[PDB]
Design a protein around this ligand. Structure first.
Ligand code: MET
Ligand code: ZN
Ligand code: ZN
Lengths: 150, 151
């Protein structure tokens, strides 16, 4: 399936979960992952904080994982979505996400790409909140979440 | 090291469709990523609830008009969406598909697909009225294929 029918009341955040896999015409695979920060419907990450997380993780995830096609916030704002070129590898993605979260928690330099030239809403950021969201996930501890279908 | 930061956001002219990048799998298949821009960078942003609804609506509507869709995701800057597609670059065809999907979005008077505590991580944070108007605004202004201007 390209997108499994997930029961959001059954998962246990924070986690890494293979959200789907698409086969390309030549036989390669694109794997999609649900990088869940918060428990579905128990709160959301503020828009400025998730915007900063996107800027930081776009770089940090790529520092720890090859084949990343996109790292983007989810509309529900409880986590990030990522598409990767490669066979499903939840364990490898979890370790990469963990390393990237440590980079994020300790990011005390200016936020990369924040300017009128490089960002579509450079006034809407929050490094302190992004760093703390990363710290909270690490404190809670990641796990590979199984997909529970509705 | 993030390609997104290399686009000169002061030079583009929203709304538009723009090929943001192309990657190839080990065997040679192309994965094209498109910048589907609703608002002019830094001149305002789409409300979180509205962009959340757009994500739900375009997920189905883009697939109805275009093959090989990987996903449609909202941008953190909330001025547009990113969409990866399995296939060679085709900005013109993607523009036509986005145009048809926006017509479907603007006229969407049925329930928002996938909205319930079971199917969505923040089911109360939606705004169909606002999403439909944003689709209507893009169509009113008119889409075009935007060339990438590098910094
Ligand atoms: C604006 S930070 C970059 C985010 C973009 N979705 C990426 O995959 O790099
Ligand atoms: Zn930005
Ligand atoms: Zn949702």
């Amino acid at each position: 399936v390209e997108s499994f029918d997930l029961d959001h009341t059954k998962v246990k955040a924070p986690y890494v979960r293979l959200a789907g896999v698409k086969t390309t015409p030549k036989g390669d695979q694109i794997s999609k992952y649900d990088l869940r920060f918060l428990q579905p419907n128990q709160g959301a990450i503020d828009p400025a904080a998730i915007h900063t997380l996107e800027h930081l993780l776009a770089g940090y995830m790529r520092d720890h994982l090859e084949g990343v096609v996109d790292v983007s916030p989810m509309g529900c704002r409880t986590g990030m979505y990522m598409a990767v070129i490669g066979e499903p590898d939840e364990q490898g993605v979890m370790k990469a996400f963990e390393a990237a979260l440590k980079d994020t928690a300790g990011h005390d330099q200016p936020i990369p790409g924040v300017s009128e030239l490089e960002c579509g809403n450079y006034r809407d950021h929050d490094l302190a909140a992004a760093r703390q969201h990363a710290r909270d996930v690490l404190d809670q501890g990641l796990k590979v979440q199984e997909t529970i279908l509705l």
